[PDB]
Design a protein around this ligand. Structure first.
Ligand code: HEM
Length: 148
């Protein structure tokens, strides 16, 4: 496809340094939606502030995990049916550790921001569209995980 290459080449710059880009993604996330902050419960503490999240090794390990799932989605961009079953468990595994569904849209907007910031003009409207389609299929898979 056109779309599949737009994804792959955009993701290339990001995969150089997933934690750095993932940190943008999560900092944006809490900027948009500070109420997600308590859902990362790591040794019975809530982060008080967004920046607290940035000092948690477990939060950063979570950033790595997020980026690796998106990396898988990119590897399978031509056919995402192969990751559907995982993504559904991930969604289930989300709700099971407490996380809400609505907020995955906010993750998607955060991902787009991170790409846009990282790629600047190379992030064309068609890349945005393609990413929005890629990520949208991730979330649709994942949403099955909230059985229904
Ligand atoms: C609002 C968004 C999110 C919140 C609040 C959140 C929170 C959590 C929490 C609390 C866990 C359990 C503790 C941990 O393993 O770090 C978890 C696990 C996980 N999250 Fe997220 N998460 C979110 C989004 C995402 C997204 C978008 C992805 C991937 C695209 C992702 C990938 C994972 C993975 C891979 C795990 C480990 C799951 C397993 O046990 O197999 N998360 N997340």
């Amino acid at each position: 496809r056109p779309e599949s290459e737009l994804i792959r080449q955009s993701w290339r710059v990001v995969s150089r340094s997933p934690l750095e880009h993932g940190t943008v993604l999560f900092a944006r996330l809490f900027a948009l939606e500070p109420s997600l902050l308590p859902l990362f419960q790591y040794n019975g503490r809530q982060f008080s502030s967004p920046e607290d999240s940035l000092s948690s090794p477990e939060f950063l390990d979570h950033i790595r995990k997020v980026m690796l799932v998106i990396d898988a989605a990119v590897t399978n961009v031509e056919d995402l049916s192969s990751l559907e079953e995982y993504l559904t468990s991930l969604g289930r595994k989300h709700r099971a550790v407490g996380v809400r569904l609505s907020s995955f849209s906010t993750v998607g907007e955060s991902l787009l921001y991170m790409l846009e910031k990282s790629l600047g003009p190379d992030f064309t409207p068609a890349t945005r569209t393609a990413w929005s389609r890629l990520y949208g299929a991730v979330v649709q898979a994942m949403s099955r995980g909230w059985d229904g």
